[PDB]
mmCIF file of C-alpha atoms in Angstrom:
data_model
loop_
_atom_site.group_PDB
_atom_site.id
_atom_site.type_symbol
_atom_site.label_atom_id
_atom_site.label_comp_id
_atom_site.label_asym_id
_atom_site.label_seq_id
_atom_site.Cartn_x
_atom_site.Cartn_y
_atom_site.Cartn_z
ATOM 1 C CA UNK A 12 109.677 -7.065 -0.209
ATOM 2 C CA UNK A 13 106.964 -9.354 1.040
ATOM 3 C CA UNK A 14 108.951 -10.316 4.046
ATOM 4 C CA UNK A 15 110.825 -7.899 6.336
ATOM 5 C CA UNK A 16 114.074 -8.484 7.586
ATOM 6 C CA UNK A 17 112.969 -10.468 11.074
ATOM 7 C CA UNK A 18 110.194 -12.659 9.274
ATOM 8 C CA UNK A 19 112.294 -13.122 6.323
ATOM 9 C CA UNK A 20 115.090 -14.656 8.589
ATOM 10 C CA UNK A 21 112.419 -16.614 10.634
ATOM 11 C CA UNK A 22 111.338 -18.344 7.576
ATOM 12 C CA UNK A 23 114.568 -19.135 6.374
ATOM 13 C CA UNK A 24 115.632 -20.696 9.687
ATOM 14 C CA UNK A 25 112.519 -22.476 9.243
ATOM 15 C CA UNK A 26 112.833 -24.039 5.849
ATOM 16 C CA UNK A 27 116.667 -25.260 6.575
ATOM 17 C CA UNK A 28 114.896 -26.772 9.893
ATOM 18 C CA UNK A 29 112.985 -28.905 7.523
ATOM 19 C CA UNK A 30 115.694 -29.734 5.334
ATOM 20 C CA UNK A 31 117.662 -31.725 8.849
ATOM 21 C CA UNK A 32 114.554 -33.341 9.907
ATOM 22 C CA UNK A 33 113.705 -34.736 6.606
ATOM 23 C CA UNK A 34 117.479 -35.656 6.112
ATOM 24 C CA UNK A 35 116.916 -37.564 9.201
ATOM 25 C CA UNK A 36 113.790 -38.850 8.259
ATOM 26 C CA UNK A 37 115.402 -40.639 5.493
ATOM 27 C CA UNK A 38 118.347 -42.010 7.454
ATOM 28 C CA UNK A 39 115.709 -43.899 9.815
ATOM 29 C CA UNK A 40 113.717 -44.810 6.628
ATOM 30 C CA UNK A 41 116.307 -46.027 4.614
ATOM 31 C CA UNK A 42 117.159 -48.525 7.862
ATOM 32 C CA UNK A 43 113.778 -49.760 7.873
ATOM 33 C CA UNK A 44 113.211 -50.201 4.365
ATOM 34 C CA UNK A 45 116.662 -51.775 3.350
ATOM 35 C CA UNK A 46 116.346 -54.326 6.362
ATOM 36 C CA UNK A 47 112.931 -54.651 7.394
ATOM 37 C CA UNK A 48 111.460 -56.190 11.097
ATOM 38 C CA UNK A 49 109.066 -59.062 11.456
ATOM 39 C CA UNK A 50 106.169 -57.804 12.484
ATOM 40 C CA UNK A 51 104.287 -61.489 12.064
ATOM 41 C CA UNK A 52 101.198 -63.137 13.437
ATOM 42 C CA UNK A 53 97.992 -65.249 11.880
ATOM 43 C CA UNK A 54 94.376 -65.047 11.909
ATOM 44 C CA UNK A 55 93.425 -67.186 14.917
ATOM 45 C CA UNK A 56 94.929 -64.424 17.874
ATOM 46 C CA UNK A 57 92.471 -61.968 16.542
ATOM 47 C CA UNK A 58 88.493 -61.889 16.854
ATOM 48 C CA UNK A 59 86.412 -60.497 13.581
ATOM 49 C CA UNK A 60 84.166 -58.082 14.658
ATOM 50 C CA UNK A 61 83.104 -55.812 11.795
ATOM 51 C CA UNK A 62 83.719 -54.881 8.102
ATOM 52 C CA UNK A 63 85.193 -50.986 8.073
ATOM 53 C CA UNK A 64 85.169 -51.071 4.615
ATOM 54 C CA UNK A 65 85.347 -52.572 0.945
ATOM 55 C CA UNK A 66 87.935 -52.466 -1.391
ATOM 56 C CA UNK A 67 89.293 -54.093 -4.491
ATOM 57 C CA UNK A 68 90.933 -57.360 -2.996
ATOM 58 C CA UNK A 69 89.124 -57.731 -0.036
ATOM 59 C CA UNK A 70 87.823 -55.587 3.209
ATOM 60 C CA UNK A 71 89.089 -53.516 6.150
ATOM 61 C CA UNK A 72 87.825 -55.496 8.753
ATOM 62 C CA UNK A 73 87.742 -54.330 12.832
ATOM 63 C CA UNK A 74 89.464 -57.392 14.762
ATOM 64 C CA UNK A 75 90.403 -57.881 18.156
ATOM 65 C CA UNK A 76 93.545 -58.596 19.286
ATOM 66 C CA UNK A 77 92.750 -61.582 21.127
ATOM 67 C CA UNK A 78 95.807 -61.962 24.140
ATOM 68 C CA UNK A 79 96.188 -57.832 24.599
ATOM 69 C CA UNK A 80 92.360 -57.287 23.755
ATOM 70 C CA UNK A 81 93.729 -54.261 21.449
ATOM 71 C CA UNK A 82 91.677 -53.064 18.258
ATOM 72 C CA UNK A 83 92.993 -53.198 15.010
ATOM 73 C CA UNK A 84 92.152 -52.585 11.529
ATOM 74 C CA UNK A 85 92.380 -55.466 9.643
ATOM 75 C CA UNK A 86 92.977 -55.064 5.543
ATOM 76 C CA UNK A 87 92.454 -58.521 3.981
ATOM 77 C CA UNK A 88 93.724 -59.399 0.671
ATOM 78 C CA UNK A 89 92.721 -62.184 -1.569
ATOM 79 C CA UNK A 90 95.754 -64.162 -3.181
ATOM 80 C CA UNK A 91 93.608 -64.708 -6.501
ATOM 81 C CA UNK A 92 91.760 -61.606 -6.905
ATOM 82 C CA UNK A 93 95.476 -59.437 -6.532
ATOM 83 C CA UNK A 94 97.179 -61.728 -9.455
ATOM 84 C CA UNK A 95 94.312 -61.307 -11.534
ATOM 85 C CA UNK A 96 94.213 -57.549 -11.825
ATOM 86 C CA UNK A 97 98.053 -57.564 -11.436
ATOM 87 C CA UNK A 98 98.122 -55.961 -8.226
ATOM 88 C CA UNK A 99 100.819 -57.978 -7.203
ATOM 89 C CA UNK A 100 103.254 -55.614 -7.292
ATOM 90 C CA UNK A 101 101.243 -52.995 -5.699
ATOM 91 C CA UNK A 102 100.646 -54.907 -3.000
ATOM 92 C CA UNK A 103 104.128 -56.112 -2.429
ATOM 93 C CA UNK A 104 104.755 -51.587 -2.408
ATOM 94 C CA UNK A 105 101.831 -51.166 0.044
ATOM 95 C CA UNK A 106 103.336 -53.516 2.881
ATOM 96 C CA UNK A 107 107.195 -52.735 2.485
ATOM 97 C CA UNK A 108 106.200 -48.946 2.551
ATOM 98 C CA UNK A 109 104.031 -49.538 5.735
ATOM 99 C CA UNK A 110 106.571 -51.237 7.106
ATOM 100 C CA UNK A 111 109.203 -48.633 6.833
ATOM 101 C CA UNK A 112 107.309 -45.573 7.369
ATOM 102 C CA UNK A 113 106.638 -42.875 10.319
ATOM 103 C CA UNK A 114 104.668 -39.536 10.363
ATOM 104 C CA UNK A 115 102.346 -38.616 12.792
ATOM 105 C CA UNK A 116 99.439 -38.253 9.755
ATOM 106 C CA UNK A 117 100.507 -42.258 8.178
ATOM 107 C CA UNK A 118 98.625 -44.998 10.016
ATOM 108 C CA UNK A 119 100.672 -47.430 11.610
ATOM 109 C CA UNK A 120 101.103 -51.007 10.433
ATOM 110 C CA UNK A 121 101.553 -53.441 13.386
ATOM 111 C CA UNK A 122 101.651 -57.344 11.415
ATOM 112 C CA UNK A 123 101.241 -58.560 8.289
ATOM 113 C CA UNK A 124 101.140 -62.384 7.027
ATOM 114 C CA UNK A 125 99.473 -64.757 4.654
ATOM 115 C CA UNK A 126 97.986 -67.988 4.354
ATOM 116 C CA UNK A 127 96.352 -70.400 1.477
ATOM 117 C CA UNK A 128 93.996 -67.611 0.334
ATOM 118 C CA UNK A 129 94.621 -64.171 1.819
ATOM 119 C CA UNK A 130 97.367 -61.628 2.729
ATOM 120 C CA UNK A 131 96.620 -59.655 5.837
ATOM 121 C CA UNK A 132 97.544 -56.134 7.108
ATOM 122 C CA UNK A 133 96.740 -54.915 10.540
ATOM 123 C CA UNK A 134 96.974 -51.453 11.075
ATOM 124 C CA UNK A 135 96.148 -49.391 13.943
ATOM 125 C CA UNK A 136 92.418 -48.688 14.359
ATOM 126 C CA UNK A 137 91.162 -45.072 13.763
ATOM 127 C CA UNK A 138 88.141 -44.513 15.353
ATOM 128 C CA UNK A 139 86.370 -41.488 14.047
ATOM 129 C CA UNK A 140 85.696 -42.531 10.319
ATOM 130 C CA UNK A 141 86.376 -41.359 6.960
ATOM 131 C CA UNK A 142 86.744 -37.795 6.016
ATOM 132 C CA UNK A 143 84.431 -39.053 3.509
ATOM 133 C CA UNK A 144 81.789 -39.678 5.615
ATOM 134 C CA UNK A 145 81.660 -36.686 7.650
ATOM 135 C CA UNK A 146 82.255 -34.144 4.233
ATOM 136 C CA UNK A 147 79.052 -35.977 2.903
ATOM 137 C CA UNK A 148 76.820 -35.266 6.137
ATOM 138 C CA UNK A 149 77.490 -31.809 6.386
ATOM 139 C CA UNK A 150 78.000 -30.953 2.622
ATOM 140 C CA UNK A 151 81.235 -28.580 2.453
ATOM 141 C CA UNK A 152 83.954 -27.729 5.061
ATOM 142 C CA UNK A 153 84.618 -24.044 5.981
ATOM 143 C CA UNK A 154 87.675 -22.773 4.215
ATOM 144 C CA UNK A 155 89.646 -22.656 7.751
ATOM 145 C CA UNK A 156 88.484 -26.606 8.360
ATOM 146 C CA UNK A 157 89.586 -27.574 4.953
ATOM 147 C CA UNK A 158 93.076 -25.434 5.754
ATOM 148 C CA UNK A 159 93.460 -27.880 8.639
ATOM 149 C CA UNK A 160 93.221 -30.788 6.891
ATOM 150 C CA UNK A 161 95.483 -29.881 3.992
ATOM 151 C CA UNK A 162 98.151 -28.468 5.999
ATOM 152 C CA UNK A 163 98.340 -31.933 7.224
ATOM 153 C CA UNK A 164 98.297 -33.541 4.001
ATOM 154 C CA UNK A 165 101.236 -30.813 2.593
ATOM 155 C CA UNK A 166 103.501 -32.226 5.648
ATOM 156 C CA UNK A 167 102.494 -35.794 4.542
ATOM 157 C CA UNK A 168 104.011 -35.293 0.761
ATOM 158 C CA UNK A 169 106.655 -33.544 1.831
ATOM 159 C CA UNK A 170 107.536 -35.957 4.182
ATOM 160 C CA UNK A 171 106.544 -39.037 1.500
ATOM 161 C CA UNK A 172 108.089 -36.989 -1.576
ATOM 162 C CA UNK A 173 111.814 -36.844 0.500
ATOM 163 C CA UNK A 174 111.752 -40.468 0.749
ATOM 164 C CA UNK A 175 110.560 -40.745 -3.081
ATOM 165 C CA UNK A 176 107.431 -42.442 -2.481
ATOM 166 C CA UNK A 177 104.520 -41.167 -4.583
ATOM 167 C CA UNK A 178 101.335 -41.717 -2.739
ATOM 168 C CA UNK A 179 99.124 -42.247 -5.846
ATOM 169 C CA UNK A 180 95.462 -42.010 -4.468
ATOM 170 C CA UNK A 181 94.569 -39.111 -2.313
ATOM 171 C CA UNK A 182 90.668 -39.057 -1.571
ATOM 172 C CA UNK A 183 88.639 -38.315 1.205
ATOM 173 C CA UNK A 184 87.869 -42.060 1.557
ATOM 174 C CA UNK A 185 91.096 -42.698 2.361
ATOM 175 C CA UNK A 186 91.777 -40.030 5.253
ATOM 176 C CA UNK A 187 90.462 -41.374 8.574
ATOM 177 C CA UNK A 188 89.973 -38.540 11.050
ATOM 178 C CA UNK A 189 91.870 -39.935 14.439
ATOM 179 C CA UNK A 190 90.276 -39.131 18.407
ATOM 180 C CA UNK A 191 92.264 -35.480 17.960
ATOM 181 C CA UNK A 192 90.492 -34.798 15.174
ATOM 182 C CA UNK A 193 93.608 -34.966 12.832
ATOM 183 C CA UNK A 194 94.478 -37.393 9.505
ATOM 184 C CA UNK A 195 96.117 -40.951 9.532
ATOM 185 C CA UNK A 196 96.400 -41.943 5.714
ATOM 186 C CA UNK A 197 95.346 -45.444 5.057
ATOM 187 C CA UNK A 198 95.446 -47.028 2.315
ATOM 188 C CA UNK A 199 98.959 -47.190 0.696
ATOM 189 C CA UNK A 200 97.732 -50.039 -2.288
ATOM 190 C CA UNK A 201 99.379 -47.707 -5.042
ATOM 191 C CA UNK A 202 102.599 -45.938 -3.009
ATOM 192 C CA UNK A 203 105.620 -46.871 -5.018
ATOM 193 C CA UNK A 204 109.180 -45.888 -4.554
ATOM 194 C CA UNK A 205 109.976 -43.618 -7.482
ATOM 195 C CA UNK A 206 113.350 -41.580 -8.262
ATOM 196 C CA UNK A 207 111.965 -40.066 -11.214
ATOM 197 C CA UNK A 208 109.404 -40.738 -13.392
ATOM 198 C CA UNK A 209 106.592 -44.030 -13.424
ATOM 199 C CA UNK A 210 103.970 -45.539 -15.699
ATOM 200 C CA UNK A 211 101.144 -47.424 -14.024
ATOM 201 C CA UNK A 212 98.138 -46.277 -14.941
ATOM 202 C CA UNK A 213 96.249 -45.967 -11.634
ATOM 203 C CA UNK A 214 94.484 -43.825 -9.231
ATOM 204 C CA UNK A 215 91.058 -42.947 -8.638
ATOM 205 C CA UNK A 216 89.756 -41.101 -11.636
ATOM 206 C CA UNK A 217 88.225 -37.758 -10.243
ATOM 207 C CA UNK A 218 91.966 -37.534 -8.698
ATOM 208 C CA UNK A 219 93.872 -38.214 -11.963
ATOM 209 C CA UNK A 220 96.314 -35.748 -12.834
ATOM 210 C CA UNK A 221 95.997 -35.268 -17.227
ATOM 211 C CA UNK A 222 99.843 -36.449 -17.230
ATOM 212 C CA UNK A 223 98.655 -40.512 -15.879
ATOM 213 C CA UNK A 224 95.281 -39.869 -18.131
ATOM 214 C CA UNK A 225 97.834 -38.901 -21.043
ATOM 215 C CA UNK A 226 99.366 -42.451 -20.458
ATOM 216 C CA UNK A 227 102.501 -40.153 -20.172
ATOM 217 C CA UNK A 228 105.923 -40.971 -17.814
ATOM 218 C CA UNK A 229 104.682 -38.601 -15.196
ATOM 219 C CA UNK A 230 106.452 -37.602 -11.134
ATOM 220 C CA UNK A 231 105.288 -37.263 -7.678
ATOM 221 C CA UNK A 232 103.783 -33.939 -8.922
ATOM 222 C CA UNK A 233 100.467 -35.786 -9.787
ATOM 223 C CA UNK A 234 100.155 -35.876 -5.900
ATOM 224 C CA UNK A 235 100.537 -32.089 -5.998
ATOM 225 C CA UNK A 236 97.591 -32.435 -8.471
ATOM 226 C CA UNK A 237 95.554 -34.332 -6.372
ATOM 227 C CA UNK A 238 95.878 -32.719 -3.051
ATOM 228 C CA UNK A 239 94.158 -29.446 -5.589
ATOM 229 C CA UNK A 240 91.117 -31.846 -6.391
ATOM 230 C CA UNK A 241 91.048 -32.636 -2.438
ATOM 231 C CA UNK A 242 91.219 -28.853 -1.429
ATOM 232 C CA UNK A 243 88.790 -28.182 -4.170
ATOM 233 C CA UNK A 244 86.316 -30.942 -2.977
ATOM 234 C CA UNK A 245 86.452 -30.032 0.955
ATOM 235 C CA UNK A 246 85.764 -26.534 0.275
ATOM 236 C CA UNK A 247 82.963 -26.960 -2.162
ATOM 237 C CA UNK A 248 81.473 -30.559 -1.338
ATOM 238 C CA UNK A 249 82.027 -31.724 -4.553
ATOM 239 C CA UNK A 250 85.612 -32.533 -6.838
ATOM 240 C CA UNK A 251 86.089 -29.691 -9.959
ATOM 241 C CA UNK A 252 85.996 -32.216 -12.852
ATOM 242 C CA UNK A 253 82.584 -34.329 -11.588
ATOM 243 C CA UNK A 254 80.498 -36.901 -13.643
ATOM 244 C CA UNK A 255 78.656 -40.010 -13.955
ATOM 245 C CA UNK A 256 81.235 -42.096 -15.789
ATOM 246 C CA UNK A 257 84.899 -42.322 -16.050
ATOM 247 C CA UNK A 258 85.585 -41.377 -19.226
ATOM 248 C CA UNK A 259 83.967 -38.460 -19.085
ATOM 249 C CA UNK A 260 85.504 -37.365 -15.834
ATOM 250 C CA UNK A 261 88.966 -38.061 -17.812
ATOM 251 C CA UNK A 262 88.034 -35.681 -20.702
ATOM 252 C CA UNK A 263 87.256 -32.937 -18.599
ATOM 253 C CA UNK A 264 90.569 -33.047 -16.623
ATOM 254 C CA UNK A 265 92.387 -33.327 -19.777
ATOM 255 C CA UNK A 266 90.438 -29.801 -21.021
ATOM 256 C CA UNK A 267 91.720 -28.969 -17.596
ATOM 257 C CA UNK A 268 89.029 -25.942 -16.888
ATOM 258 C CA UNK A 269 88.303 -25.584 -13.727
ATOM 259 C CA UNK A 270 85.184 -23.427 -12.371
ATOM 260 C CA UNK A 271 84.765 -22.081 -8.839
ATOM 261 C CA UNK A 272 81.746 -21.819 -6.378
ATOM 262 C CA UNK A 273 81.212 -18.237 -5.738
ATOM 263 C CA UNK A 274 82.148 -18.513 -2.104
ATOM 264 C CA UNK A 275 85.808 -19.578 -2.600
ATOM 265 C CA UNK A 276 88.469 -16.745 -1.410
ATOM 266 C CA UNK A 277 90.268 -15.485 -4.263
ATOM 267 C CA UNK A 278 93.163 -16.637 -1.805
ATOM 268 C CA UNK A 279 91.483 -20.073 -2.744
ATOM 269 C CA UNK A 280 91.387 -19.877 -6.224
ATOM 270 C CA UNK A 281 94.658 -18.966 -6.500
ATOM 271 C CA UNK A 282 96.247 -21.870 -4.971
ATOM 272 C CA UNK A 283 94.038 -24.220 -6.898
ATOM 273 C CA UNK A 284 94.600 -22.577 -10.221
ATOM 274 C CA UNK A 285 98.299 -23.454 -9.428
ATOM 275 C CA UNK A 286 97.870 -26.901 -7.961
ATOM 276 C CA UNK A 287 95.243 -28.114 -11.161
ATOM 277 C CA UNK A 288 98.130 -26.842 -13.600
ATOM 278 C CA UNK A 289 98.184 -28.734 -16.442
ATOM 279 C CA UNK A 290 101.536 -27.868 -17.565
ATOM 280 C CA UNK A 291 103.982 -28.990 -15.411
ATOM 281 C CA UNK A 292 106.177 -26.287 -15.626
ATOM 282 C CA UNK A 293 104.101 -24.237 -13.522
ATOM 283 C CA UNK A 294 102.567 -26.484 -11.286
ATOM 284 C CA UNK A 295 103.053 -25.563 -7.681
ATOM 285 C CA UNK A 296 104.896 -28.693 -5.782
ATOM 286 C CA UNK A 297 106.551 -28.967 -9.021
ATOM 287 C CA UNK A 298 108.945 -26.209 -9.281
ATOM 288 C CA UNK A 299 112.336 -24.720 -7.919
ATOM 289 C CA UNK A 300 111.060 -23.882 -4.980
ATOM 290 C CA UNK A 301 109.650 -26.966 -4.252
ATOM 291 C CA UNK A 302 106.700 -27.377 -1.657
ATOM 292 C CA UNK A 303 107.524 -23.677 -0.230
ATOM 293 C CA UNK A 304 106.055 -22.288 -3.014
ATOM 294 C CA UNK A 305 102.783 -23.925 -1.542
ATOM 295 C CA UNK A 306 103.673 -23.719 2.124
ATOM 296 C CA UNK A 307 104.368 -19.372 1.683
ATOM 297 C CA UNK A 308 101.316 -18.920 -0.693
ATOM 298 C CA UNK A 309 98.527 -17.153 0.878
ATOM 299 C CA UNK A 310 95.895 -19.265 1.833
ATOM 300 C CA UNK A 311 97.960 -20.548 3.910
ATOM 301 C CA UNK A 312 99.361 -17.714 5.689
ATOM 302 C CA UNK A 313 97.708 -18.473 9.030
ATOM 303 C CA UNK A 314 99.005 -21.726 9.188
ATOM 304 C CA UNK A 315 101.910 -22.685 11.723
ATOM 305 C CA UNK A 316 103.467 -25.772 10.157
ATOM 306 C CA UNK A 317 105.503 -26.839 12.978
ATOM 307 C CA UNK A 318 102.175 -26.440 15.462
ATOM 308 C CA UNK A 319 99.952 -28.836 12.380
ATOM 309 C CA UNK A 320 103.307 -31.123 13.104
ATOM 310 C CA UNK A 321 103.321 -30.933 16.667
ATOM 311 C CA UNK A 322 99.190 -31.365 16.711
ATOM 312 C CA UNK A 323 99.145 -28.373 19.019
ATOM 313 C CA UNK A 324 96.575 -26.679 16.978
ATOM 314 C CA UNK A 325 92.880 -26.844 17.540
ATOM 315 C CA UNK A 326 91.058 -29.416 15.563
ATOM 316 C CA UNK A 327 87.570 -27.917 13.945
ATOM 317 C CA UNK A 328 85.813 -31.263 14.681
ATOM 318 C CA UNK A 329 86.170 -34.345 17.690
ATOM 319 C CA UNK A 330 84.769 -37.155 16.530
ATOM 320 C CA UNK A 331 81.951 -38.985 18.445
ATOM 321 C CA UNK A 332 84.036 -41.626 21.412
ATOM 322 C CA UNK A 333 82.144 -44.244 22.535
ATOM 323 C CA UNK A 334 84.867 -46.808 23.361
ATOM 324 C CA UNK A 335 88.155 -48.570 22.201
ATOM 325 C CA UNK A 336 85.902 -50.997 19.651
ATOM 326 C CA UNK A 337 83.095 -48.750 18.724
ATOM 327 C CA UNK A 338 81.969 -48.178 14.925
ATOM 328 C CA UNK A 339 79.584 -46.025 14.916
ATOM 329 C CA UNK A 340 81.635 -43.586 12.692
ATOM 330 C CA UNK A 341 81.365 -46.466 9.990
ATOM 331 C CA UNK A 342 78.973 -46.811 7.582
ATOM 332 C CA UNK A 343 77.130 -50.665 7.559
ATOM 333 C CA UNK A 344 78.539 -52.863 4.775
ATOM 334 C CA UNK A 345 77.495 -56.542 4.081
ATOM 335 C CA UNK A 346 79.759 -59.188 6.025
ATOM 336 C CA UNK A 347 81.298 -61.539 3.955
ATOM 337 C CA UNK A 348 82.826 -65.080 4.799
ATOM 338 C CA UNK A 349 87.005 -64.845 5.171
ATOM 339 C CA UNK A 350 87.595 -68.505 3.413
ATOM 340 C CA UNK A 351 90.773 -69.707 3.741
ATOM 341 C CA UNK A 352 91.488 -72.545 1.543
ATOM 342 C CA UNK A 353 92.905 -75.818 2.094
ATOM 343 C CA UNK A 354 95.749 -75.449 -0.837
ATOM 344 C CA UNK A 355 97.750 -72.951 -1.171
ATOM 345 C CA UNK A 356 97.239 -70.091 -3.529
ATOM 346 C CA UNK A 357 99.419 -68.283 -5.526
ATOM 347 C CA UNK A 358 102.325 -69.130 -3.361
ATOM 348 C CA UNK A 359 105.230 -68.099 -6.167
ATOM 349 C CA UNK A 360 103.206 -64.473 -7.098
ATOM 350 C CA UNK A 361 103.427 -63.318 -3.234
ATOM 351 C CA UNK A 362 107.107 -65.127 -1.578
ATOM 352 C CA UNK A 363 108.265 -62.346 -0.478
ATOM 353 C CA UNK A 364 105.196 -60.763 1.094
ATOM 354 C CA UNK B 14 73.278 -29.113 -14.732
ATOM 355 C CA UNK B 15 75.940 -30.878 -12.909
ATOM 356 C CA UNK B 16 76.089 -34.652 -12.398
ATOM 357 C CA UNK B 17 78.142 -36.707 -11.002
ATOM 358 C CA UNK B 18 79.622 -39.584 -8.370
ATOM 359 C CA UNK B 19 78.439 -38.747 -4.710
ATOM 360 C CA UNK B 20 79.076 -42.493 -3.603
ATOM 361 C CA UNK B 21 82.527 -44.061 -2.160
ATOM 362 C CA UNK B 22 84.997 -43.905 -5.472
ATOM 363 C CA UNK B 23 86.912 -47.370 -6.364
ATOM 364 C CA UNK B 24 90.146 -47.321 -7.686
ATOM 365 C CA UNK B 25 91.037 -48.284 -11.137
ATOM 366 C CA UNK B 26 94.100 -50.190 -11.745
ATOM 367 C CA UNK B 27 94.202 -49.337 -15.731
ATOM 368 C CA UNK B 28 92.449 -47.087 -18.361
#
């Protein structure tokens, strides 16, 4: 076979190994989400000191914690914008998930609370900016640098997927490179508990597995789908089904053909021919074998999953450190007013927020 | 000749 006796033993040992932690994992989880901790505090012990980013809803804001002089990252929600687009929900998933959580790769929510206008999340702060960012600068990761990252995001689903959360919006926006150089996902607006299938129609489209496209009951293997389109974008500095406007980005990951740069490994290719699998009887992440069909395959052969874990392996970039509070791995976005009303909003939509 | 979205990518919360 592939394997020889010793290796084949080694790997076995290995994949039972995971099977007790993430039993554990779920134990502690189950704990935390069944009877969650306060974790409250409002907006006048923190200083506002710069917008981190945009979203729907609101901003990530960099605030000061004003009695331990911490930094945090600060995700501010308006009441009347999240009813509107019926984000309610979502929102209500993004917290309680937060809450409950723990992974070395998942940032860490410290408080959350509300008043008259907003709903507030502070999270640690994650110095060294978006993957976005720094995948834009230098065009394209090598295929080793883009290994890295994935590896960690493969732990991360496998981890999330245990617990039945779907994460729901993989992009490199979303994956904030930390002093070591390795992930923290942020940005859990569309997580959602799930024991089998869901319906929302949501995402980001260039991410979009067909089956949510489809409008069709689809599983946590649309993350599978998504981590391909993330693999595919840091090794080629652009996502495989690319356009100007939504729809047509839809229609061409319904047709589902996917072309390569010439540079790719055939290693490469491989895996993403089996992650961008339309039919989900042969996507990878999706089958008996479960995420050790894309743990074993390959392109990932020189990976040492418990070392990614342990963040004992070499990270191919260290992001510029210029102290505790420093932004200058953000890009500049206008600064908007944070108005909180007199009367309450939306009080009955967010109770138990 | 390919086109498409180099800027930050928003979420859509239907289709």
């Amino acid at each position: 076979g592939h394997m020889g006796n010793a290796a084949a033993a080694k790997k076995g040992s290995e994949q039972e190994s995971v099977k007790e932690f993430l039993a554990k994992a779920k134990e502690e989880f189950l704990k935390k989400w069944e009877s969650p901790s306060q974790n409250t505090a409002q907006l006048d012990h923190f200083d506002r000191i710069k917008t981190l980013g945009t979203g729907s809803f609101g901003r990530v804001m960099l605030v000061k914690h004003k009695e331990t002089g911490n930094h945090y990252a600060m995700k501010i929600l308006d009441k009347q914008k999240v009813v509107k687009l019926k984000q309610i929900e979502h929102t209500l998933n993004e917290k309680r998930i937060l809450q409950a959580v723990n992974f070395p790769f998942l940032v860490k929510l410290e408080f959350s609370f509300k008043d008259n206008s907003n709903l507030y999340m502070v999270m640690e702060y994650v110095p060294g900016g978006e993957m976005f960012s720094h995948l834009r600068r230098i065009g394209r990761f090598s295929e080793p640098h883009a290994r890295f990252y994935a590896a960690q995001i493969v732990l991360t689903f496998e981890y999330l997927h245990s617990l039945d959360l779907i994460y729901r919006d993989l992009k490199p926006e979303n994956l904030l490179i930390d002093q070591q150089g390795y992930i923290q996902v942020t940005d859990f607006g569309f997580a959602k508990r799930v024991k089998g299938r869901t319906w929302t129609l949501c995402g980001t489209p260039e991410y979009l597995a067909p089956e949510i496209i489809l409008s069709k009951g689809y599983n946590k293997a649309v993350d599978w789908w998504a981590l391909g389109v993330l693999i595919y974008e840091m090794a080629a500095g652009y996502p495989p089904f690319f356009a100007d406007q939504p729809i047509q980005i839809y229609e061409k990951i319904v047709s589902g053909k996917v072309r390569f740069p010439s540079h790719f490994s055939s290693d490469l290719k491989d895996l993403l021919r089996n992650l961008l699998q339309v039919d989900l009887t042969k996507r990878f992440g999706n089958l008996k074998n479960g995420v050790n069909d894309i743990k074993n395959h390959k392109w990932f052969a020189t990976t040492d999953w418990i070392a990614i874990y342990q963040r004992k392996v070499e990270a191919p970039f260290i992001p510029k450190f210029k102290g505790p509070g420093d932004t200058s791995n953000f890009d500049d976005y206008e600064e908007e007013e944070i108005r909180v009303s007199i009367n309450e909003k939306c009080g009955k939509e967010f109770t138990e927020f | 000749i390919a086109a498409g979205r180099t800027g930050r990518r928003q979420a859509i919360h239907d289709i």
